[PDB]
Design a protein around this ligand. Sequence first.
Ligand code: ZN
Ligand code: ZN
Ligand code: ZN
Lengths: 116, 107, 107, 121
Amino acid sequence: QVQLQESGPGLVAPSQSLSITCTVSGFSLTGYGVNWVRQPPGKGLEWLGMIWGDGNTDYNSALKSRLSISKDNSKSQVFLKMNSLHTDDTARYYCARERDYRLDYWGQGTTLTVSS
Amino acid sequence: DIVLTQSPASLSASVGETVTITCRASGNIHNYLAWYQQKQGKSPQLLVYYTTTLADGVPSRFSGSGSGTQYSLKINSLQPEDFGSYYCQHFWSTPRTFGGGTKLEIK
Amino acid sequence: DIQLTQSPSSLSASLGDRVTISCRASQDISNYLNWYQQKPDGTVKLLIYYTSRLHSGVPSRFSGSGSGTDYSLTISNLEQEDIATYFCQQGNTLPWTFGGGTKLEIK
Amino acid sequence: QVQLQQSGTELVKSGASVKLSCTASGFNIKDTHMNWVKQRPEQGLEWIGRIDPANGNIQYDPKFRGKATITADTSSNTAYLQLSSLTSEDTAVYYCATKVIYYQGRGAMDYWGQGTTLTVS
Ligand SMILES: [Zn+2]
Ligand SMILES: [Zn+2]
Ligand SMILES: [Zn+2]
């Protein structure tokens, strides 16, 4: 049964680092990729990065200095790490499964607010 | 990186109508285009992939078309549950990018 | 169609040697180049893919490099189990194409 | 354990037709793309085409359309390649291959069958 679910800290202050987890079930992480996508309040979907079934990553060229994605193949989890947060990083964050070049299953997302 | 340009930003329509939304790449993404539907505060849902193929379970009233740098989604006979925001995203090279979206609203 | 030129077409070296095989595309392939080894019994395996990613179970003595139109495979410390025919294959645009192959012999 | 099991009618006569098979094991084919690749005696490899069993998408190298037909039975976890009008030109070894891990990039084929030799007479 395919499920992907994100967990986040809900609210963080600017400059802090952030970690959001994606626990998946119903499939293995070696036959798929998981993409991280975010959506600022009142805006479209913005791509962040992906982790391939083989472990390699690819990031959004503009965030790449502050972004890091890894995964624990055994715990069935994928992690997104961000550093030096901006107040404009406020968004709802999703993880989604990439199968044969399409994002077929998405999580429900988690809302991150960068406060002060 | 390749960029997606979606026309139109907004589209007011009434049920029964057939609308067409378009996405133009900044380079040939060779049919590696997907379309998504996102209804009010929900996760985007896959409709069409590989330019024309329908996601299992999507009503055939949706049909995807295109090639090169020019792609489009046609909804023949809008049902009231079709209204929402639509997004195209390519899978030709990383960074994968999304179109700006089209907000389909009831006229 | 995208053509791959592989050279040399055949060669001989000796145990411990370092050989280099070149593969050149009729057009830019943006690193979508994979290398295969076909043992004498017909068996085929994936050595390297995406230009330089080593497939697991494959010795670090095999290395891959390239960019644009020119790619190469380097096997250092030639071993006996290397007597094989190497083929490169582009995965940039369908249909996939392979090089003519390079038959390696230990002298 | 992942593996492709290949067999089919080896020695055929001119103008005949033959159907070769490739039975998967260790994974379900609805999850990958099955590729058929040929190799003429002392020649390079040529990709004939592939099928996605999950959706019926079949892609061919234009020079094999009409000659070759890719088919898959998810019921039996088996893919097939039918060849028509067997001319001498078709005497070769035929492999099937797929990609199980979602590698970075595109086009890689990590598991291959052992090959089926076809001798047109
Ligand atoms: Zn900022
Ligand atoms: Zn050509
Ligand atoms: Zn497919």
